[PDB]
Amino acid sequence: PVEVTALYATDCVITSSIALLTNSLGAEPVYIFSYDAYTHTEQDRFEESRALYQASGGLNGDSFRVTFCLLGTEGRTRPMFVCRFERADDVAALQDALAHGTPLQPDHIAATLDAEATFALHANMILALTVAINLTTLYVHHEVRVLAAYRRAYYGSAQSPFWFLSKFGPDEKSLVLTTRYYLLQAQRLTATYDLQAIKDICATYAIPHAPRPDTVSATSFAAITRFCCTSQYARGAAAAGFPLYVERRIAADVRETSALEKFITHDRSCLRVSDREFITYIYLAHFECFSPPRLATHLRAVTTHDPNPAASTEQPSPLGREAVEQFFCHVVSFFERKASRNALEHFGTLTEVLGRYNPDAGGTVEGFASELLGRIVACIFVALCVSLCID
């Protein structure tokens, strides 16, 4: 029984789901935008996930349990209904939907719907709405209230494809991997981070890219399922190794950040120095630990080229070791003659500019002095870059 958690989409989603579960009318074909796959060491996880998927075909499983979830908090996703596709036609339909992207017709959803858990995860809210009024087939009398209740329960259930494209990045890899991982596997599997963190991690997941046989790009929910499901990133080694790479990158960044922060705090809480030197130390240590060149070096050290963890093209992070040559404060201050030096290589004199102008004795001393231009007066102490005691 392979477990397949799927975030579906419709052309309202809540009304379609309620109609589909009740007895049917309002049943719109669902669009499996993101689908999960798991069954009950890191290499073993990679091989299991890769064998569960297939390079040529889809999910390799004779029996499929497919939980359908929407966006909202019960948890980023919340189960909406549960279906078991065990019949051969059901398995074929699921294979053609998860891989090719064909939407599931209402008849397949109704026939494969497992009433037990599907209504066991909703009888609580059915009783809640019954108490509010004082199975869910009795919503004909009170229907808009039920609609509002499921709108509030599943926040983000009804969203536009433009929303998905804007949130989860414009790129193929970013879209598929960030969406699937962040929305489903973060809760399923640690890595409870922000969407920006997942998008940046997927950005440096430089696995070999191959152009699609045809050139298409994502209006309304008619195309994004085919855009995402048939992509080479949602199947095989990429899908098998993306969570592993996210975990490895998170662990590496956390260990380097902690190693830097220990020294940063220790050599900050023990300085018996002036406030100016203290601020200089803080802004020098933050530059020494997070310089754009050093951050780029760390990113190129932690990036991988192959999904398989066995290859492990990632190199050890040199950020801490590079910071060692500067964090030697065992004891013009040492912090100044570093800060200025530091600033020069990353930013930009009176003598040279005066040599360029060859105004002390020249005619230009009065070229801006007597020319008050009508502002104020004290003239040729209300001193005169004029009118001082402007920018």
Partner 1 sequence: TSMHGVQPILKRIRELSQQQLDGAQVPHLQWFRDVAALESPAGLPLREFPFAVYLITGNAGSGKSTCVQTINEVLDCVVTGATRIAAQNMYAKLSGAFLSRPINTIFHEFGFRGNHVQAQLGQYPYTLTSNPASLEDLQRRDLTYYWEVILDLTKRALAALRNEFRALAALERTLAEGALTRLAPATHGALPAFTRSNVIVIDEAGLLGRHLLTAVVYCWWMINALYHTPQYAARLRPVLVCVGSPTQTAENVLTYLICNRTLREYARLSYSWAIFINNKRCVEHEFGNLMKVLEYGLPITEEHMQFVDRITNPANLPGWTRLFSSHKEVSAYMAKLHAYLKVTRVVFTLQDQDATYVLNTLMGYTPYVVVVNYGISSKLAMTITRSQGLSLDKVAICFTPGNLRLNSAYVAMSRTTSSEFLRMNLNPLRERHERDDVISEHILSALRDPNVVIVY
Interface with partner 1 by CB under 8 A: which residues? Answer: 71, 73, 124-125, 127-129, 131-132, 148-149, 152-153, 155-156, 166-167, 192-197, 200, 253-254, 257, 261, 264-266, 268-269, 271, 275-276, 278-279, 282-283, 286, 290, 295, 343, 347-348, 385, 387-391
* Residue 291 lies near ligand A1BXD (rule: CB under 6 A): yes
Q: Which residues of 211-236 are buried (b: 16+ CB within 10 A; e: fewer)?
A: eeeeeeebeebeebbbbbbebbbbbb
Tell whether residue 339 is a contact of ligand A1BXD (CB under 6 A): yes
Residue 284 interacts with which of ligand A1BXD, partner 1, none, CB < 5 to 8 Å by class? ligand A1BXD
> CA–CA separation, 381 vs 52, rounded Å?
85
Which of the listed partners (ligand A1BXD, partner 1, none) does 193 bind, with a CB threshold of 5 to 8 Å by partner kind? partner 1
Measure the CA–CA gap between 84 and 349, rounded to whole angstroms: 76
Closest to ligand A1BXD by CB, 73 vs 333, is 333
Long-range Cβ pairs for the range 321-329 (8 Å, 24+)? 322/294, 322/297, 323/260, 323/263, 323/288, 323/289, 323/294, 326/288, 327/263, 327/267, 327/285, 327/288, 329/267
Tell me whether residue 138 or residue 343 sits nearer to partner 1 (CB atom).
343
CA 297/CA 277 separation, integer angstroms: 29
Which of ligand A1BXD, partner 1, none does residue 342 bind (CB under 5 to 8 Å by kind)?
ligand A1BXD
Partner whose footprint covers residue 119, from ligand A1BXD, partner 1, none (CB < 5 to 8 Å by kind): none
Given a contact cutoff of 8 angstroms between Cβ atoms, the answer to whether 34 and 184 are in contact is yes
Minimal distance in Å, beta carbon 343 to ligand A1BXD? Answer: 4
> Minimum Å distance from CB 337 to ligand A1BXD?
10
N- to C-terminal Cα separation, the chain: 72
Name the residue among 180, 178, 179 with its Cα closest to residue 198: 178
The residue range among 186-194, 211-219, 287-295, 322-330 that interacts with ligand A1BXD, by the rule CB under 6 A, is: 287-295
User: At 72, which amino acid appears?
Assistant: G
What is the spatial distance between Cα 382 and Cα 80, in angstroms, rounded to a whole number? 76
Say which entry of partner 1, ligand A1BXD, none residue 71 contacts (CB below 5 to 8 A, set by partner kind).
partner 1
Q: List strands edge to edge, sheet with 64-71.
A: 31-35, 2-9, 64-71, 77-85
**Nearest partner of 100 among 232, 11, 225, 214, judged by Cα:** 225
Q: Which region among 47-55, 148-156, 158-166, 279-287 touches ligand A1BXD (by CB under 6 A)?
A: 279-287
What is the C-alpha separation between 306 and 237, in angstroms, rounded?
A: 9
Site for ligand A1BXD in 130-159 (CB under 6 A): none
- Given the rule CB under 6 A, which of 89-97, 177-185, 202-210, 336-344 is the region that contacts ligand A1BXD? 336-344
Which is closer to ligand A1BXD, CB of 115 or CB of 343? 343
**Piece of 20-28, 262-270, 315-323, 342-350 that binds ligand A1BXD (CB under 6 A):** 342-350
Q: Output the 3-class SS for 183-221.
A: HHHHHHCCCCCCHHHHHHHHHCCCCCCCCCCCCCCCCCC
Residue 284 near ligand A1BXD by CB under 6 A: yes
Binding piece for ligand A1BXD, criterion CB under 6 A, among 268-276, 280-288, 348-356, 362-370: 280-288
Phi first, then psi: give them for residue 103, nearest 5 degrees.
-65, 150
Name the residues that contact ligand A1BXD, by CB under 6 A.
283-284, 286-287, 290-291, 339, 342-343, 346
